[PDB]
Amino acid sequence: SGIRIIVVALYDYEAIHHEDLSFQKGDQMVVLEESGEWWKARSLATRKEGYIPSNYVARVDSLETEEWFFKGISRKDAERQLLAPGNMLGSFMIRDSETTKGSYSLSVRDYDPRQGDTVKHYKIRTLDNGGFYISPRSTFSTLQELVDHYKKGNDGLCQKLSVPCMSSKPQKPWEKDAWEIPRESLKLEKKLGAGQFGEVWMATYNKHTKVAVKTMKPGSMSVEAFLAEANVMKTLQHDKLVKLHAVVTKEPIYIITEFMAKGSLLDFLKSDEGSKQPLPKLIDFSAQIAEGMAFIEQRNYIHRDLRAANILVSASLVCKIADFGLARVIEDNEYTAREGAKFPIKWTAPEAINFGSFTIKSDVWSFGILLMEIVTYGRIPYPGMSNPEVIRALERGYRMPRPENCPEELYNIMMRCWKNRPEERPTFEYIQSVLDDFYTATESQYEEIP
Ligand SMILES: Cc1ccc(-c2nn(C(C)(C)C)c3ncnc(N)c23)cc1
Fold this sequence. Notes:
By secondary structure, this protein is α+β, with helices and mostly antiparallel strands. The protein has four domains: 3-65, SH3 Domains (SH3 type barrels); 66-167, SH2 domain (SHC Adaptor Protein, 2-Layer Sandwich), CATH 3.30.505.10; 178-263, Phosphorylase Kinase, domain 1 (2-Layer Sandwich); 264-438, Transferase(Phosphotransferase) domain 1 (Transferase(Phosphotransferase), domain 1, Orthogonal Bundle), CATH 1.10.510. Helices cover 25% and strands 20% of the residues. It is built from twelve helices and 17 strands. The chain is globular. Bound molecules: 1-TER-butyl-3-P-tolyl-1H-pyrazolo[3,4-D]pyrimidin-4-ylamine. 1-TER-butyl-3-P-tolyl-1H-pyrazolo[3,4-D]pyrimidin-4-ylamine binds next to strand 11, strand 13 and strand 15. The PDB classes it as tyrosine kinase. Keywords: tyrosine kinase-inhibitor complex, down-regulated kinase, ordered activation loop, tyrosine kinase.
């Protein structure tokens, strides 16, 4: 029935927009409109009404109000966050279980001289008729008690729980209904990089938000077609895809996205900090991208220009796929015919080059080339070969050989991505599964207790 809905603020929030409602952590509010990213609410205190970020609130006393609970985070991301600098031995998080829907799992930071810093995962079994336990020995009535216990001596766990994984306050969502924005709302500051169809600049939106802005040269794309495609792009929200905030619809077209501190994966890998990334880390980067592509696969979209130059790296080293789908609206006569020095021939599937048959399978081929760029620290594909020679060689059966520092198992995946018949290439869902669990040899990744 029309029951009043109440929520509690998970963080403080300062109004920056006109109809914004400011609140401090803990305050409770009534939900008036549940319009996606922003909700219209009412303060039980000042009785004032305004719009609030939907990700800043949650049901009262819900599980998301606890410091030790991490909602909607996968096993792999739980590992990446716990391993991030700032955490310590015993750092943990209780999260929703991916393996056993409805149940929970505990992730704990560990360490041994052989593997170094690692993250161990334990299944928390939910007993019918109340109860929680990792060990049928130490049972508890609530997750909080489970934490308090293991927070006092490991009692079997690989480690003694210390403190919750470090997390930074979620960034404010983009202004409500600010999809098509006036060019003057942006202040372009410094040039971040160039491109064949546009440049990328660092900028500030309405003096309050730092963003990256890609500027497309006039005539580089159909304005009407771009807009239609951008309306699909913006809906592809995932941790492994760069967020697309807004666009300026008049030429020169502007595509506003979140800013990624470490640039493209390509530049990052060729840099100093990049050269120091161990093979296991490079594989994890590959798994992250595959994860992003599996999302694109699920949503029936296509990247069309997948390559290391189009993967961005955040300050915490998280990969974000960029430019997905943009290639479809480029006008350039040569580019449209998959010809010329502007077209990504070396990364493109034979059927896409020959008949313009772009599908999620042509992206799989591209991912294979991307895998090679990654394992070689950004080296150019088919070194020394020209586009005509590559096209000819591939038709002959040629495939780039396996580099010295590239494990055979990783190379085998590349080879499957480069099958001439698109239907014989694996899905990104499969590729992600193989890369997420590429290591820790044997395993059923779920430390059993004890
Ligand atoms: C639509 C779109 C918009 C911007 C970018 C982008 N390109 N680049 C470079 C190339 C400089 C690394 C970036 N560097 C930091 N942050 C970014 N967001 C970008 C990519 C795609």
